[PDB]
């Protein structure tokens, strides 16, 4: 209706990102950065739909195994030179061989990529992979197993293209600030560690015409009460996905049409480091599952709108739907504490000689409030038989610590990379990139296995229900509940839907009002 004059928006990305690297990274601040700067074949409208990014058309063999992308004939990199199906050949390699390191290596694997495992595992060199230019501006993939969501995949960061002839230059120093090359909506005009990133608009992005937010800072509050304040006080236009549980039911009151609160496909999590002593115990494990009341948590310590959950997969993502809570959730605490208990007498624990450990989590007043809250229920709720510290690290240090098995019991969440059960299924294969709690069941690995094969959704719900059974009896983490993304955005912001399941941020989707 009546659009302002600047277009400038200030977000809170919430930590300093680990890298503007796709190929580096896990996490949300790193994939909201890198979403600004780069396109993948296929991206997103405000509620998480799919329109076309870097391919403009693209179609799929009946199989569902052969997928064929047909790229911008005349697409440019932000420094001019042509955005080819090469770059995505070059991508999607440099995304799997082992020499990147990359922590979503294994993505491609979950796209059923011709080769991408053995790839993953040293067995084949990256550019066996199934995936190729028959063109140039022609990307065909080649699946082994029926993807029928393979489009949706593509979505995902680590799927996004790289300036091929930029970073064979300049190896991994491509990515500083005065070097960087993308085909997104965005550049960055500048990077402060700690306490900015600034966007310019990338005037070479292929729908440049269709871009509204001219300029854009990304701050990094790691904690909500701060964020909220910063809000408040008119110097931010919307939060992280966090607030402060002690001010939200007057925040919707006070500031009644700002706060936005989007169903998210998110778990989250107590990640047990399977391979450490004493978790490589499953009693333990249990004792662990048992003794913590998720109620307390969603109800008393947040109270948002998270739900109560004791398995990985949100059962409300397309085709987790037979997926089953597991029996002692349906039981007494009375009793539930009991059977703790014993289990841990059974393995050598007293109020004298208590389980003791450290809960890892990344820096945020939310985090700690549940982390006390854990660790207060543990100890009460087996009569001192559980005696946990608490230990917060920077979102960056987190993350490495969690990759190099540095913890006991991590805070963790994971967000669909895509709307479909297997975004969470595949994290526990024994051989995932992103299987950080080091948890391996060769029973796990072949339900998902048998679950690529099936031809049908029901076949396919019916294995991941397997695997969450085989997941939840080995008691592999401790799932806690299902996101809510609460967020407070200003009456001049629109393009913020909160209904994309994902609760992705595109600056390219937003515009400010008068």
């Not at 005349?74 to 420094?79: E, G, R």
């Not at 990256?126 to 979505?155: C, I, M, Q, R, W």
């Not at 960055?188 to 070479?204: C, M, S, T």
């Not at 990094?220 to 236009?237: F, H, K, M, Q």
């Amino acid at each position: 209706t009546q659009l302002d004059e600047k277009q400038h928006i200030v977000i809170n990305n919430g930590a300093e990102p680990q890298s503007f690297d796709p190929h580096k990274t896990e996490g949300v601040p790193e994939s909201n950065v890198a979403y600004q700067l780069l396109e993948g074949l296929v991206t997103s409208d405000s509620e998480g739909k799919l329109q076309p990014g870097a391919a403009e058309s693209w179609e799929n063999t009946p199989d569902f195994k052969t997928w064929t992308f047909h790229l911008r004939k005349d697409a440019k990199w932000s420094n001019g030179d042509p955005v080819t199906a090469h770059d995505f050949v070059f991508a999607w390699r440099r995304l799997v061989d082992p020499a990147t390191a990359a922590p979503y290596a294994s993505y491609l694997s979950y796209l059923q990529v011709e080769n991408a495992q053995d790839i993953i595992d040293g067995k084949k060199k990256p550019a066996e992979l199934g995936v190729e230019a028959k063109d140039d501006y022609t990307f065909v993939v080649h699946a082994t197993n029926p993807v029928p969501y393979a489009v949706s995949l593509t979505t995902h960061q680590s799927l996004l293209p790289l300036p091929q002839k930029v970073v064979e230059k300049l190896g991994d120093a491509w990515v500083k600030k005065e070097n960087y090359v993308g085909n997104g909506a965005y550049k960055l005009a500048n990077h402060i560690i700690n306490e900015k990133i600034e966007f310019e608009r990338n005037p070479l992005y292929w729908n440049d015409k269709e871009t509204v937010i001219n300029s854009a800072t990304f701050l990094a509050i790691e904690n909500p009460s701060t964020d909220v304040a910063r809000y408040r006080a008119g110097d931010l236009d919307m939060t992280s996905y966090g607030l402060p549980p002690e001010q939200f039911a007057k925040l919707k009151k006070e500031l009644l049409g700002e706060v936005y609160v989007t169903r998210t496909l998110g778990t989250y999590s107590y990640e047990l480091n399977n391979k450490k002593a004493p978790f490589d115990n499953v009693n333990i494990r249990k004792a662990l599952n048992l003794s913590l009341d998720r109620n307390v948590i969603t109800d008393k310590v947040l109270g948002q709108g998270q739900t109560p959950t004791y398995v990985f997969t949100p059962t409300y993502i397309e085709e987790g739907h037979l997926i089953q809570q597991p029996a002692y959730s349906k039981e007494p605490m009375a009793q539930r504490n009991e059977e703790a208990i014993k289990l841990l007498e059974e393995a050598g624990y007293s109020k004298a000689n208590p389980l003791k450990f450290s809960i890892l989590y990344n820096t945020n007043e939310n985090h700690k409030k549940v982390a006390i809250a854990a660790a207060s229920m543990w100890k009460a709720n087996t009569k001192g038989l559980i005696d946990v510290k608490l230990e917060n690290q920077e979102w960056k240090t987190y993350i490495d610590s969690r990759r190099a098995g540095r913890y006991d019991v991590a805070r963790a969440g994971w967000h669909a990379d895509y709307n479909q059960a297997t975004t969470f299924g595949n994290y526990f294969l024994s051989n995932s990139s992103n299987n950080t709690a080091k948890y391996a069941n060769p029973e796990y690995d072949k339900a998902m296995a048998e679950s690529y094969a099936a031809t049908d959704a029901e076949g396919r719900a019916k294995a991941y229900a397997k695997a969450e059974e085989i997941l939840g009896k080995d008691y592999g983490i401790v799932p806690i509940f299902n996101y809510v993304n609460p967020r407070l955005v200003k009456p001049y912001v629109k393009g913020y839907s909160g209904k994309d399941p994902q609760d992705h941020i595109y600056l390219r989707n937003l515009y400010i009002i008068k």
